[PDB]
RNA sequence: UUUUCGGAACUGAGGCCAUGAUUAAGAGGGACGGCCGGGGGCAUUCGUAUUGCGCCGCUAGAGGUGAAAUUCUUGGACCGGCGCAAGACGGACCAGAGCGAAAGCAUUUGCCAAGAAUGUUUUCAUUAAUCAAGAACGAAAGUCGGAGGUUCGAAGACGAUCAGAUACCGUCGUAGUUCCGACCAUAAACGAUGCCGACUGGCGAUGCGGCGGCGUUAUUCCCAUGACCCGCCGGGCAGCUUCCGGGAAACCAAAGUCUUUGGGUUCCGGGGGGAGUAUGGUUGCAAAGCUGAAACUUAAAGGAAUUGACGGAAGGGCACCACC
RNA sequence: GCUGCAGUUAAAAAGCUCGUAGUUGGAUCUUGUGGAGGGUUCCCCGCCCCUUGCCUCUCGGCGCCGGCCCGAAGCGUUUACUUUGAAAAAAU
């Protein structure tokens, strides 16, 4: 279930058994790489990149036509972002909450919701820092939020 | 159940049980020792004292009788207890301002029967038992 | 249950009408389709639940309107599986 | 969650047997569950079973008879030392004439009657009768 | 003197490695799409009523109760008509419906940020569950400082009722009720039912999303779409049904899967009183909150259910020892 | 009350949520054949690639006819667990 909501749901994607499908695909491994690199230039990030490939081209997943994935492809260039998009999107969000709180100070509901998203940063960070994908000196703060968002 | 059953949860079990044992009624008298301190006995089976004065106690309802007790102060703690006299007419075999030997009732701190406030009885009046006085195996030495 | 259940082998398509992860072997129920709308003669391939506008490079350049479900088509033309 | 896979499996087969079902569906498959059910089949408490394959964790389907009565899990997994064995074997079995507490040893997974003949203790898993 | 051997360190380029990446959870996180809701904050619109005031008209009583009275009244009340002001408040629509972590939340429109469910052949690759310490929110009443003050109203003053009546009832009325800024942490804060996970009957509805369809209807004949009809898949509030099983019973598809006793984990209980008292600590401006004994006393206290009796309870029926 | 208790109404779930320690934590990385001991396949040597993983060797024995073969020497990433030894005063 959800980590700070009561709900219990399902919407999880389900892949097929066969992974060599649909067997007519235009383009092959090398071609897919240059197709990806173009997209990352334009400001797209690995989740967006795979969508824009899957929807309008014969690719189902880049996992099923190469031995890599979207992130590893970007990493081989050195064109991968400096911190996970996951971590970024939490930090990106929490600044807007803090803005609304400065503009309106009687919004106790907002004050509550910030505590949830705040704690969710720290938990996520405690995955990364043990896996050495961040500096072990790095810590989340009000100040670091300001600098990383702008 | 409703409790942890890990293989490394020895501490959380052995500290919990050591705490919830204090709520037990029996344990809480035994281990605080306030029982002993409050008792007119030191925790000895008997005790010895000197008679102060005869009294009579009127029994709790529905029974009506006069139960012919004594009141005695003790040697070994200098404090006073109201003590039953058993059998019939053994009030007469007790004479004031002599020593006696007391003993608990047989219900360990709680009044027995229809008589209230009396948790003690009497066994010897002058090294001669109430049994032997009553039966006639011995006689009061005057 | 009637206690006559067969779980070794699936039901003809009453197995294939349940939620997609309660099937004996999981599968998506989404599919692709090879579309060629009038005036831009090229075999475009599009996902059924596209989520986004799909373009063509000819005179036509609009093909979908995003929907939560299957996206609406701007002109009702072309459906393929295709293949698998 | 599902912190004990074996514990969730057996409760299904317990519930199912009571109703009288002779086909069930158990998930997720694990190799540990396979060798468990192998021992339970040899003695003859259950019949042949089919492992459906996915690319996730599998699912299993079983053919069973009314012969089974109760298979349990023991959590956490205690050690046994072949004199502790007898103390166990009293508690989990209704009789001295039947029932098999199961366990795992360095000589593999087996029943207790067999483990005593290998002369090796190990970690206990469950039981049945 | 010199190599060799041996030991060690550091530097380049090249052969040889199926030359190296487990799967992607009916675990979680994150992106994306279309929606949804009395969810929250700020701003703004509106309605009627109530009280008071101004103006106009009509004349003798008006309020109120079981019955009365206090009280109001020819400068005319009450009532009718017309206009004005203030503060409060969103009826009927509004339901075994929705949203919210809980406390809670219903006039319009705009703005600000937020969230669930569903859809997904996208992304990450175990990032989880429950939780000492510690933290956020937390009705009503109350306290402090300002603003405001209709309505209702503890306190208080009267009028009745009653032997008495410091009460029920009637009239008047302060604190408060309202808002702004600080505190206070408690409730039958009740589903008197921890949270997370798995398995095990039936049926019909209802709210939200998605999917399919012979049918009708609304507009340009349409398509796009809405309304209704029929069925399916998720997750949500509930109901009905019974020899699943449980329970002391009442009852409960969970309070089930339990002497055939062991899925994960926190909090908490040990006869009734003495007592949430004594005492010290800690928190608070105050009011008080949290933590929290013992001496001594007693053989019952309590739960569910059944039979009686009783009722200034309800429904039938009867008598000149009851009435008319 | 670990084995082995209870928490709707009998005594009893913090108002509610967050959260560090603690506790607990998904799947995933090997099976068949002759001889020997026991059945009619199945549980000390070996074989398909592996089989107590290797070498490197050199010093002190065993061999066979200078030359060659195989025991002892480093060890298989670490623990728990389990099994065997050593080691333990008497009295009880």
Task: Tell me the major beta sheet of chain B.
Answer: 5 strands, antiparallel
Strand and helix order of chain D: HHEEEEHEEHE
Greatest interface (CB-CB under 8 A), with counts per chain? A-C, 19 and 20 residues
The share of residues in helices of chain B is 10-25%
> Which fold does the CATH topology of the largest domain in chain D refer to?
Ribosomal Protein S8, Chain: A, domain 1
β-strand number of chain D: 7
Structural class of chain B: alpha+beta
Number of helices of chain B: 5
Oligomer: part of a larger assembly
**% residues in beta strands of chain D:** 25-35%
Bulk shape of chain D: globular
Strand order of the largest sheet of chain B: 3-2-1-4-5
Verbal overview:
The structure is cut from a larger assembly and holds chains A (150 residues), B (142 residues), C (84 residues) and D (129 residues). In chain A, 52% of the residues lie in helices and 0% in strands. By secondary structure, chain A is an all-alpha fold. Chain A has two domains: 26-80, no CATH class; 81-150, Orthogonal Bundle (Helix Hairpins). By secondary structure, chain B is an alpha+beta fold. Chain B contains five helices and five strands. A five-stranded antiparallel beta sheet of chain B has the order 3-2-1-4-5, with no helix packed on it. The longest helix of chain B has 6 residues, at 25-30. The N and C termini of chain B lie far apart (71 Å). Chain C is an all-beta fold and 84 residues long. In chain C, strands 1-2 form a two-stranded antiparallel ribbon. A two-stranded antiparallel ribbon of chain C has the order 3-4. Chain D is an alpha+beta fold and 129 residues long. Chain D has two domains: 1-68, Ribosomal Protein S8, Chain: A, domain 1, CATH 3.30.1370; 69-129, Dna Ligase, domain 1. Chain D is built from four helices and seven strands, in the order H-H-E-E-E-E-H-E-E-H-E. In chain D, strands 3, 4, 5, 6 and 7 form a five-stranded antiparallel beta sheet that branches. In chain D, strands 1-2 form a two-stranded antiparallel ribbon. Chain A binds chain C through residues 10, 12-18, 21-24, 51-52, 54-58, and chain C through 19-21, 25-28, 32, 44-47, 50-52, 54-55, 82-84. The structure holds two RNA strands.
